[PDB]
Amino acid sequence: SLALIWDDLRSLCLFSYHRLRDLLLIVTRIVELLGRRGWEALKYWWNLLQYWSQELKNSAVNLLNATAIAVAEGTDRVIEVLQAAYRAIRHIPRRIRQGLERILL
């Protein structure tokens, strides 16, 4: 049915176009209409995001370094650690997961 194929194609054509532009326009419109106030929220998430991230990073590194400098002044720490660790490992050797994780990241 030629009239059928044509009527369908046409109907779906205009419908599809108007539809795409309809949903697109509505969504976009709301996005630009909400961005006005949503701007603040977005900025907050971004700021806090980078803030916390860098905060934990800078702090973490600062704690490790500072600790090393404070521990470097005393070999006792290294001895107590190396000894203790090796002690538990010698009496109870259990560190196979080290490899599994080592071959992961």
Side-chain angles (χ1 to χ4, degrees), residues 6-105:
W6 216 242
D7 286 26
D8 197 64
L9 216 184
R10 190 187 197 81
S11 199
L12 193 79
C13 189
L14 204 169
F15 191 73
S16 164
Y17 185 47
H18 210 79
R19 154 177 195 174
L20 276 172
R21 205 158 189 191
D22 177 66
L23 292 181
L24 282 163
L25 278 169
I26 300 152
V27 178
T28 55
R29 263 296 189 81
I30 302 165
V31 179
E32 205 173 356
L33 245 62
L34 190 283
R36 189 84 274 170
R37 206 271 275 177
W39 179 232
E40 280 84 276
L42 292 168
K43 291 197 285 194
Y44 263 101
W45 293 123
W46 201 240
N47 217 41
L48 269 89
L49 269 173
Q50 290 292 4
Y51 168 43
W52 297 128
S53 204
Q54 171 62 299
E55 168 61 40
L56 274 170
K57 193 170 72 189
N58 174 267
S59 190
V61 181
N62 189 43
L63 204 80
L64 299 161
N65 216 343
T67 294
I69 302 304
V71 173
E73 187 167 349
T75 315
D76 163 88
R77 201 75 58 195
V78 179
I79 301 158
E80 171 159 67
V81 179
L82 202 59
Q83 171 63 303
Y86 188 40
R87 256 284 88 70
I89 297 295
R90 266 216 59 80
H91 297 326
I92 307 176
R94 274 296 205 281
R95 287 297 196 175
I96 184 64
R97 276 202 74 181
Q98 203 74 19
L100 187 60
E101 70 177 9
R102 176 159 300 163
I103 66 179
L104 155 59
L105 73 163

